[PDB]
């Protein structure tokens, strides 16, 4: 079955931090403290991947505002990550990005999140985990299709709006568009409108 | 494992068409003819659902342009769908929507797409199936979080762009933002830029 | 078969007589009330209303012989509420006073063996003791409708057997002559006839 | 899974005919020819049983008119069946009844129709079988409750009427009150009234 | 086989000599009486009555050697009662004074290995001694059986016990 | 379930014939030709058994007349059988009997007919097999009696009476 | 795998003693007390076997001296054994032998020692068990010879020589 | 057991009397020669040489009854060769003229049920007749064995065959 | 073990000497070339470069004895290309001329039993015949490096054995004295020594 | 999964010591005390084997200096081992060697170190074991290839040096050329050079 609306599978991975030092990150350290945006990409030194990593790092402050930890994940080793960070953008590199990059060297994280493609690389996936360690959102793109940062942010905004108010977020909801109480009266006022 | 980047699971369901007549729709009838946007929602006569169904129906012409068939799916019966269509918007109804609504009365479609929540209702899911019957995109939201129509459309645009050109779509790509050839040179020009 | 045995346990979300939502389980009537659990395929269909309306018309007859009337279909409780708010002139059941159970997981239809084609429950009556023992089962395939006069007769026969220890003959009703479950007995009843 | 609405379990059994001769009846010999009212009763020399068997034989003409073969069945041997016919009503016998009584000596018929109680005797069950061999109606009573001949005849009328007109019969339908079109306009027409 | 070993336990509804209903089990006899458990196929047959009538006629010979006579078939207790109440002229066994067990579930026939075609028991004798050991077994396919032989058998068995 | 009223289990055994020569006897050689009274006894050289086997041999003529082959069977070897036939009656032997004695040396026959006791020896038993090889009658004695030569003769006549008439 | 050099399989058998009385003999009664020469032969009342059993009984004194209990064993019952002892030597019997003859009536002993042939009888065999109940020697003959009474006597003396010294 | 039945098939590397290497199998003897297959634990032991030397001394007695003498142990062919080349004074078997099989895999010992503690074979004799039937088996635990007895055994076996 | 047996089959995406991408399988050298398959844990690490550079320095020595030099690590071929474009002064391997295999699925490390902790291959040499038979295996745990002189010696020993049927003694090298695999033989070689 | 980098399989074996006495060696007795060079060879009275055994005994002092216990192992019995020591070099013997030779008579040691060839004999394998019992080095040759004593000693030097300095040794490392820090600056420093 699916883990969406259910407990996020545990992970522990070697990582390269924003300052380029080596470490370790696990899901547990975040439970009760902050939201986790785990994003998967297939490969270092490829094509769509760097554009996504750079786009997400530029919007890092938008994530800090929303109390979300941004974690990139690929099958590549932590040494491959550091080398990609020491590669200039004009040479296909990601440069000195500020957020943490995880190494799924065993492939077990991709296997647990059901995003491993061909026993090789992880698909382009967004996993939004709340402060209780529950998956609220899942987005999986095929290897050729890059994703939108405005969209996960809107998703984060919608989830945090529901958590605070208990209101339900309708189709196309932004801040501060009109929300809806999950009742008959309710709907019923919103559609009418 | 996952069906993203792989063959979409077959389905055959009773349906209520745009004209309110009863029929049957199966995945096979679309293979080689048009793209399929299968969207799941939990329940008729609920809250986020009608706002999504109405929002997608308003954008129906944007889907016709892109040669995509729009299919809504819930666990509810086809009789429950027709009744919801005969319910005015001011009373929590969806009104006379133009696109087809599928009845997953056996729950097997939700089970096959791994979106069945608690053996009860399907999660809010987007499944984009191409003309070869291959899943290119998957989006799963929890019950409280409504989705964006501008976003699947952008996704559809990105997939159709890649199909036509072989170019790869970077983070945040619109029409007609700059795309990228999947090579070293390549990336490498796009990031630089 | 469970006839003459204990009724399988159930616990379901329900729409009460006052249109509010709740929960009903079978254990809560043990030692308190008789239960007439009736199944019907779908809301917003055809013979279902006439059955439900006829059953609600004679609700006073059920209250008098201390029996809880419980309708159950595969539909969600929101569909049940919607059907209750639809007038008779439009195919609705109107504001009925007995409880309707939502067998949304189909668990209850499976356990009582009335699920057809892994989709909808057949038209069935199940009469449950104050001791939680099934005394009567009726299953109709075709939309032919069930006579209330007969289950009222069946309830009278079961309650007569319980009170006087007398066995109820063919065509017995309240309050014509019954027979003692003895050799003496049968012979007395059969001549003269 | 129940057999109501599906094909009746095949049976072949030794039997005592109306002329008190021994023979063999099987289910296949009626296919495309007669409706079959298979009825079960626990034991021959007991209490409710004869009253039912005699009441059913008194109404034999009405079954012959509806082209339905009346078949009694119990765990008893054919020799027990014969002895019971040779016993006067005044001694607890059924007398010289004209319809066939099947002998379920192996208990396999009761097992197959799921009416065997405690590996000993069959419950009081009516099973109505199509001319196509499809079970349309099932009625299972606990050992003490006698059944109604007027009620099964109504049931038979409701089924044969439904076969001829596709007309869906409502609650308490009798030959020949107002019946219902299985439509939307339909149910709206019938419920007003 | 159970011959020479302890008898398979049984518990059945029964019609007594006085026509009342009740229960008989194996436990109630051990250390107290010998048991002649006989099986016959069906009530209301042509062949079965003469054996049962003949066995009931020699009932005093059975009480003499302290042996409880028990008839058993797959028929219900009610079929048993009705057969006793049927006159001899019509094929009835009449008012026999020994107990008839109802093997309504066929359990007893299954356990004693005399169930034929999962329908009825064969014509069998089982002599169970006071210790619960089966000393004698006889199974006939529609063969008539003899009363004077079982009496010889019992005498011979109770002789060897003595002695 | 039981084989009474069903097909008698097949057997093939080494044997000591009436003339004290050795050979084989199997079930199939008798089908459509003779009835078979197969009788089991526990051991050669016991105290009780001679009187039974001697009594049955004394009525041999009555069996030929009823078209029944009379066959003894024990767990003992054929050499034990021959020796017992050569032991004089006063010493406790069986003398020169005329019907065949089978040797259930493997115990497989006793197992197949369910007369084996404690994996050792067969109980005292009668099995009557008709010309179609269907068992019509079975008698098992634990000890040690035994057994009316007239009764198997009686039970042979109807059976045989039923094979032609009724009841 | 084999039991030679390992623990001799346990047995308990009905037996005919030297004085023609009956009883039981088991392996455990001899542990720490006597060596055991267990010998198997196929059947009582055969042509070859007497000469072996008679030869072994003639050397009985030599076994007592070497502290070895001498035990015969066949599939036959104890009643077959007793009868064979009572058959005179001229008729083909074994006479009043003095060592015990075990009865492998269940065939379980022959199976456990792996001397059973075609589920019927044991082959001609020698099994020598020391005072610790460990098999030190095994000899199996198919037919039918057999066997040097001196050789088991020789092989008994070392074994027994090794139990005290070397090589 | 295989005594009285056909001998478990074997195929092994061997050192011949002339010290050359080759292969010996069971098939090459059936319908042609009797086979005395003997097992001993290990090359270069104190006890094992005197048996092998004694067996090779009586080789002419074995050729006389048409019986092929075969030694077998778990040692390699090279260990066999070296043992022959070792002088008698040092514990060698010397230049024996019958074949020694190498049971390097322990397969042959496993199949003949003489493998002890999954290491070495026990001291065993196996006489296989011309039809491939095992007529004689002898297994010793460090017990010395005798050459004049096997010769009696063979004579007795070939007698019974004749005759 | 597969030493002295046929090498397990492999087929891998590869980065060639000219920096282009291709595919190499083991079957393509059978009957054509000897294969020296070497494993190393990761690109952009430590002793890995010195090993790879030392192996490429003596490539002419491998060509001369007709042996294909194949490096293999768990990294993707894009990581391999990136490492080749990194200069020695920055921890890169530079423009090496022998092929590097990408064991991206880890299948090859599993089959050759050199996978440590389900993550990376150990430092291993595998020498494969022209008949596809493994003649030599070397596995180092610790980053201690492998001497080229030794596998060149090992290759000479294997090729000497193949040519003259002579067995190669302890400390043998080209072209000191070898020994015939015979009793005559060994003795000649050992005295005098 | 391989045992290289993990704990050595436990062995206990009969053995012939340097003074030609019989005894028993097991792996545990060296833990926290000695390094263990376990070496396998196929057969005693053969060809490559003695050359190797004699070459290793000539260098015994060098092992004693590195605190490593030298252990030879073959399928042969201890009595075969002893006989081979008592045989002069001129006859194909090893003579009076001073290190211990283990007897793998059950073949279980060869099986446990995965060096058994065709259930018969062990391949020519070096296994170097830690003072902690961790295998650091494995070398398996086919039956015909003799190994090098200079090479294993270099390997031992490379391991003990790595233990003391955490210093990672490069390709062709010898006691005591330039070695490498397991760093980034690191590898950049060593490769220039």
């Amino acid at each position: 079955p699916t883990y969406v609306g259910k407990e996020a599978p545990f992970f522990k991975a070697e990582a390269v931090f924003g300052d380029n030092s080596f470490g370790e990150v696990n899901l547990t350290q975040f439970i009760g403290k902050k939201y986790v945006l785990l994003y998967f990409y297939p490969l270092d030194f490829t094509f769509v991947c760097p554009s996504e990593i750079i786009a997400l790092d530029k919007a890092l402050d938008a994530f800090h505002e929303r109390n979300v930890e941004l974690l990139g994940c690929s099958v590549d080793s932590k040494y491959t990550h550091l080398a990609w960070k020491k590669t200039p953008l004009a040479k296909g590199g990601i440069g000195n990005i500020k957020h943490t990059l995880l190494s799924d060297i065993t492939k077990s994280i991709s296997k647990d999140y059901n995003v491993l493609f061909d026993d090789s690389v992880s698909l382009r996936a967004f996993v939004l985990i709340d402060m209780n360690g529950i998956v609220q959102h899942l987005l999986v793109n095929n290897l050729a299709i890059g994703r939108s940062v405005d969209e996960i942010l809107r998703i984060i905004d919608a989830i945090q709006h529901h958590e605070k108010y208990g209101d339900v977020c309708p189709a196309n909801w932004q801040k501060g568009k009109v929300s809806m109480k999950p009742s008959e009266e309710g709907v019923a006022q919103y559609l009418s409108t």
Side-chain angles (χ1 to χ4, degrees), chain A:
Chain A
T2 183
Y3 54 75
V4 185
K6 283 168 74 174
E7 176 187 1
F10 170 85
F11 64 87
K12 178 187 272 181
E14 290 168 289
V16 189
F17 296 108
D19 62 347
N20 288 19
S21 60
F22 291 138
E24 183 172 293
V25 168
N26 68 301
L27 212 177
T28 312
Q29 80 187 236
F30 300 112
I31 201 164
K33 298 187 186 186
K34 50 209 278 78
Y35 303 79
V36 181
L37 201 154
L38 216 190
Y39 78 90
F40 298 90
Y41 61 97
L43 282 176
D44 294 14
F45 296 101
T46 51
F47 324 119
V48 184
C49 310
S51 74
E52 298 179 306
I53 296 158
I54 292 158
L56 287 157
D57 201 56
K58 274 176 151 65
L60 225 213
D61 290 323
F63 294 111
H64 289 329
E65 280 208 299
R66 274 149 264 255
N67 193 224
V68 324
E69 180 76 23
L70 212 266
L71 302 175
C73 188
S74 76
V75 176
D76 303 285
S77 61
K78 62 181 183 188
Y79 299 105
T80 301
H81 289 340
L82 181 59
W84 204 21
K85 294 216 279 175
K86 290 192 169 199
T87 309
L89 315 177
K91 285 164 69 59
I94 54 169
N96 207 223
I97 68 147
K98 285 180 77 69
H99 71 269
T100 308
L101 294 175
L102 305 177
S103 173
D104 191 20
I105 193 76
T106 69
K107 296 179 203 283
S108 59
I109 307 160
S110 306
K111 280 179 186 180
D112 288 335
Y113 281 82
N114 306 111
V115 292
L116 221 206
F117 189 73
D118 285 344
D119 302 298
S120 298
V121 297
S122 66
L123 289 156
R124 292 177 206 289
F126 277 151
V127 180
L128 191 53
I129 305 156
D130 65 22
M131 288 191 287
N132 294 139
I134 300 161
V135 179
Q136 295 297 324
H137 173 84
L138 177 65
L139 186 148
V140 190
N141 283 5
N142 209 355
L143 270 68
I145 316 304
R147 41 252 223 262
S148 179
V149 52
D150 298 301
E151 184 58 30
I152 17 101
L153 257 359
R154 189 195 71 86
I155 293 299
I156 295 161
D157 284 341
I159 292 160
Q160 291 179 340
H161 194 267
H162 169 71
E163 280 170 326
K164 183 95 80 63
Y165 301 92
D167 267 41
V168 119
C169 294
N172 290 141
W173 182 91
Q174 326 286 328
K175 296 186 155 180
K177 279 182 80 272
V178 56
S179 56
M180 178 204 304
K181 49 179 79 179
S183 59
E184 179 184 20
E185 74 162 26
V187 66
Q189 182 189 297
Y190 177 89
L191 301 167
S192 319
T193 310

